[PDB]
Paper text:
We recombinantly produced the two [name] proteins from the auxin degradation locus of [name] CL14, [name]_73 (IadR) and [name]_50 (IadR2), and employed isothermal titration calorimetry to determine their binding affinities for IAA, other auxins and related aromatic compounds. Eleven additional auxin and aromatic ligands were examined, with ten exhibiting lower affinities for [name]_73 than that of IAA. [name]_73 structures complexed with nine other auxins were also determined and refined to 1.35–1.6 Å resolution. The [name]_73 structures resolved in complexes with other auxins revealed that the positions of ligand-contacting regions remained unchanged upon the binding of auxins, with the exceptions of the His-32 imidazole ring, which shifted by up to 2.9 Å, and the Arg-46 guanidinium group, which shifted by up to 4.2 Å. In both cases, these shifts accommodated differences in the carboxylate-containing substituent groups of the auxins examined.
We characterize the binding of IAA to [name]-family regulators from both iac and iad loci. The structures of MarRs from representatives of each auxin degradation operon type establish that each has distinct IAA-binding pockets.
Residue numbers in the entry:
A (entry chain A), B (entry chain A): 10 to 149
Write the structure that this text describes.
């Protein structure tokens, strides 16, 4: 059957199944999916643009802006002007947001280790390498 | 940074970027994303359950049921009773739906070939193999 080997379908199914496993943990720790994606994407990062955040969190930019309105109100993130461009807003995690998400990030790493363990280090690194190359070739 | 190598984030970004490329083609041919996923998942398939269709199309089951209401009204799919279980509904593509989607499926195969060409046959097959194994290990 067409769908059994069609790459976009395989990527989307694998992504949904693994992510839905971790979302149960995230919600048990008081996070929504979008809050978790934003804080995990910003943790240990320099400030990035709203558009970059939208791409890496796979969230539409108007949705991200509304999310940042409330996460900034809760002191978990901060928006800042671009040092040069008046049309670009940067965003960073605050210390409060980092402390809020650090434990969950450790649980995320453990869950990822469990997902990748049956494949071995070689196949795991090959998968991550291929995905990174694909993203860098298709990002706008 | 955590997010740069986190497998669920890599899978979701790669999936979104590649799929969004093909969705432009699908809509130019008059398909919505959900209609394309249903018809492509059913093409060349025996009847499958609603729950199976929801999993492979990564669409919530109530959403799939509403979608099938209108696709069945347009004669593109047919729901049928399970030969044994009264609690299971099966669904299939009709000849009309297959003829509607066949050309688009060829374009999908060409787009996939372009996406995978830089990686080579070995890395492409390794990726598809790993994704299939991951789905089969995490599907409920
Ligand atoms: O490209 C998409 O629309 C998402 C990938 C995808 C998930 N399930 C699918 C079933 C058939 C064709 C494509 C898909
Ligand atoms: O697990 C998810 O919520 C989807 C995967 C995902 C996409 N972008 C992300 C950014 C940070 C952490 C996880 C993700």
């Amino acid at each position: 059957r067409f769908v059994d080997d069609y790459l976009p379908a395989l990527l989307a199914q694998a992504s949904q199944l693994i992510s839905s496993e971790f979302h149960e943990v995230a919600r048990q720790h008081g996070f929504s999916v979008s809050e978790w994606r934003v804080m995990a994407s910003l943790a240990g990062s320099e400030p990035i643009s709203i558009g970059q955040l939208a791409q890496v969190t796979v969230t539409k930019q108007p949705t991200v802006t509304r999310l940042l309105d409330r996460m900034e109100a809760r002191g978990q993130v901060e928006r800042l002007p671009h040092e040069s461009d008046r049309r670009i807003t940067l965003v960073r995690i605050t210390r409060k947001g980092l402390k809020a998400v650090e434990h969950l990030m450790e649980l995320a790493r453990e869950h990822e280790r469990r997902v990748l363990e049956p494949f071995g280090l070689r196949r795991a690194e090959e998968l991550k390498q291929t995905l990174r190359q694909m993203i860098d070739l298709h990002v706008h």
